[PDB]
């Protein structure tokens, strides 16, 4: 209604410089944050493989009866894993 007609008076005790600075900084921060939240999701568009994958794909390593990769019988160092 006509109850909002005197809202400009807001700027007689809230100043423009600090307000503009705060707004701009906050908007950039929010932009970066939302892009990173959507990237870390199922909606990720850089890594989805649409329209095509461009890098080579992961290759699994076969395991032994203990569930970890097999040792190689003359290697002078054990084999790496990442899961334990």
């Amino acid at each position: 209604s006509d109850k909002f007609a005197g809202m400009y008076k807001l700027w007689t005790f809230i100043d423009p410089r600090r307000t503009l600075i705060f707004i701009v900084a906050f908007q950039i921060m929010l932009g970066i944050l939302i892009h990173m939240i959507v990237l870390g999701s199922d909606l990720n568009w850089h890594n989805d493989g649409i329209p095509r994958f461009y890098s080579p794909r992961p290759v699994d390593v076969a395991v032994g009866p203990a569930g970890i990769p097999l040792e190689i019988p003359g290697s002078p160092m054990p084999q790496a894993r990442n899961y334990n």
Binding site: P76, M77, P78, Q79, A80, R81, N82, Y83, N84
Partner: protein, 44 residues
């Protein structure tokens, strides 16, 4: 002193420690001492 670089083998989840560390110059002394013996021909 063991000057860099080294060889590291990861053996567990990420960010947990849990890895083995080798110095190529020290591991050469263990490699230079094994000497598998030579085969003996199977018997009739």
């Amino acid at each position: 002193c063991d000057f860099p670089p080294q060889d590291v083998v990861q053996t567990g989840y990420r960010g947990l420690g849990m890895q083995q560390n080798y110095n190529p110059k020290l591991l050469q002394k263990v490699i230079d001492a094994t000497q598998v013996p030579d085969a003996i021909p199977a018997a009739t």
